[PDB]
Design a protein around this ligand. Structure first.
Ligand SMILES: CC(C)(C)c1cccc(-c2ccc[nH]c2=O)c1
Ligand SMILES: [Zn+2]
Length: 557
């Protein structure tokens, strides 16, 4: 039961790829060790093929079947609706991959006759045909990292026509079902603030808390045909229209279970018998499968008071400790159970007794103080990848601006406030592009956001404290400092000086710009200003925000 079989044909790009960090007049002000920053290309995809290709062995016990029956019972209370062509089309990103059948992402959004006619043809084909495998494109991702070198991640996706039909049949399912089935354990329902609140409250509800994260070695490749069929049986519990049921069964047999892999040149690269990274159900299916395997493994390990938190392939468990030795022994049983269910780990899980030492979604909980010196818990991460990606975005215009998403999600952090906000507001002031909307990703979904709306947005998912945080933990400070030394980023003292300039330039401009200088850069000045609740914060249509994960699912909000 091999995840992949290969013909020998290479994974080809759609354009000339850059691996070296592009340099411009703004590069040195952010980063000096340019050699450290790189981007993955299709020319390293052969290295990934080896890693993702392996045999999957699966042993399913009563604990697995018990949890599944409980999951199907909760799923049977979900009612999901069938979306119209126009509704699914409006959810398609503008930078989305064009169809092989004469149309693109912009044609889809504009509802061109050629696109809509093909979408209807694929839909009719899904209702009539449930055996023929759907063709997918295997492409290599261009992701930017810092060295110590990752090979390119793989992206497997069906044609744009199929992707719109996937939305019609499963967009409501993947948006409603996860929270009903997993309850508070479903991580994508939370804003960064609601997440820390949930982790801190959960950690505090235990007599002697123990927490750990579980890292599955190549989760998509570990997903078996059984897992994909089990996902469909859960989707089929919902109150669905007979067209949606037929399209779900069809997309499962023909696409989700597996199919041929085709490169950008139209050559057969091989066959996939695992999870596709570029389908609508990637996030949802990964969450269901992980939660199911982990819940049953909690039961097998006899873990006391298991509180789970699942986001795709990412898993955090907070439970009652039984001492260091009994915890280490319980984590072995948990891993033995996960391995049996075809979910072995990358690095073995380790018991942690300090919430701040637990890393899940590349993030950890940390503590700072607000204006009244009161302790305040927030989400942070190592700023290496956010800084390296920002350095690339300083020289090249990318379809998705990682720095904007990073300011949104990590707004209370030291590194995002002092470096990310400073640098990019400076760039925006210079080009007078403060009023221009930029595309960014939040839980895998694409959002067109106006940078002048940043103070209202941050207040809504972090609170007003985000603008007043100080007296940061020594662990977080040394982490940021270490990252700056590594990449050659100017010290935090230089960033304060620069922020005083950016702030004054923003305030001079008045209006929304003055609000950005006021709220975002209050930390930069000794004589602080009055940070009052913003009237525009309530007037934010945050509908769709923190409902579900859509990573690789081709979603625009
Ligand atoms: C920090 C937190 C809430 C754990 C998280 C989880 C998943 C994704 C993100 C994220 C970070 C940066 C940009 N966009 C995102 O969605 C952030
Ligand atoms: Zn039982």
């Amino acid at each position: 039961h091999m995840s992949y079989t290969w013909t020998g044909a290479l994974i080809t790009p759609c354009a000339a790829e850059e691996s070296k960090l592009p340099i411009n007049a703004l590069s040195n002000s952010l980063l000096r060790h340019h050699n450290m920053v790189y981007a993955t290309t299709s020319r390293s995809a052969g290295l990934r093929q080896k890693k993702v290709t392996f045999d999957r062995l699966q042993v399913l016990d009563d604990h697995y079947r018990d949890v599944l029956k409980e999951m199907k019972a909760k799923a049977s209370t979900v009612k999901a609706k069938l979306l119209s062509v126009e509704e699914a089309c409006k959810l398609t990103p503008p930078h989305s991959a064009k169809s092989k059948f004469g149309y693109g992402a912009k044609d889809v959004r504009n509802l061109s006759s050629k696109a809509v006619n093909h979408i209807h043809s694929v839909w009719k084909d899904l209702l009539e045909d449930t055996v023929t495998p759907i063709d997918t494109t295997i492409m290599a991702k261009n992701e930017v990292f810092c060295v110590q070198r990752k090979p390119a991640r793989l992206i497997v996706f069906p044609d744009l026509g199929v992707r719109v039909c996937e939305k019609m049949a499963l967009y409501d399912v993947v948006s409603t079902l996860p929270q009903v089935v997993m309850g508070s354990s479903y991580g994508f329902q939370y804003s960064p603030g609601q997440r820390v609140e949930f982790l801190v409250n959960t950690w505090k509800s235990k007599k002697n808390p123990m927490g750990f994260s579980y890292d599955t070695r190549c989760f998509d490749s570990t997903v078996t045909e059984n897992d994909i069929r089990v996902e469909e049986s859960i989707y089929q519990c919902c109150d669905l229209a007979p067209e949606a049921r037929q399209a779900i069964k069809s997309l499962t047999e023909r696409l989700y279970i597996g199919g041929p892999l085709t490169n950008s040149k139209g050559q057969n690269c091989g066959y996939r018998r695992c999870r596709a990274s570029g389908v609508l159900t990637t996030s949802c299916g990964n969450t269901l499968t992980c939660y199911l395997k982990a819940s049953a493994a909690c039961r097998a390990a006899k873990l006391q008071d298991c509180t789970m938190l699942v986001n795709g392939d990412d898993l955090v468990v907070i439970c009652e400790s039984a001492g260091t030795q009994e915890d280490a022994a319980s984590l072995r049983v948990f891993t033995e159970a996960m391995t049996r269910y075809s979910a072995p780990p990358g690095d073995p899980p380790q018991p942690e007794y300090d919430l701040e030492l637990i890393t899940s979604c590349s993030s950890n909980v940390s503590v700072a103080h607000d204006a009244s010196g009161k302790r305040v818990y927030y989400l942070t991460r190592d700023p290496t990848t956010p800084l390296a990606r920002a350095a690339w975005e300083t020289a090249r215009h990318t379809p998705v601006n990682s720095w904007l998403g990073n300011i949104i999600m990590y707004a209370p952090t030291l590194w995002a406030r002092m470096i990310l906000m400073t640098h990019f507001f400076s760039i925006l002031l210079a080009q007078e592009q403060l009023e221009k909307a930029l595309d960014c990703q939040i839980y895998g979904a694409c959002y067109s956001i106006e940078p002048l709306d940043l103070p209202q947005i941050i207040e809504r998912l972090h609170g007003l404290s985000a603008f007043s945080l100080h007296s940061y933990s020594p662990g977080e400070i040394n982490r940021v400092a270490s990252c700056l030394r590594k990449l050659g980023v100017p010290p935090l003292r230089v960033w304060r000086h620069r922020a005083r300039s950016v702030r004054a330039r923003l305030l001079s401009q008045g209006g929304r710009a003055a609000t950005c200088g006021k709220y975002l850069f209050n930390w930069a000045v000794k004589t602080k200003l009055k940070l009052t609740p913003i009237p525009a914060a309530s007037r934010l249509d945050l509908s769709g925000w923190f409902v579900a994960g859509y990573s690789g699912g081709d979603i625009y909000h």
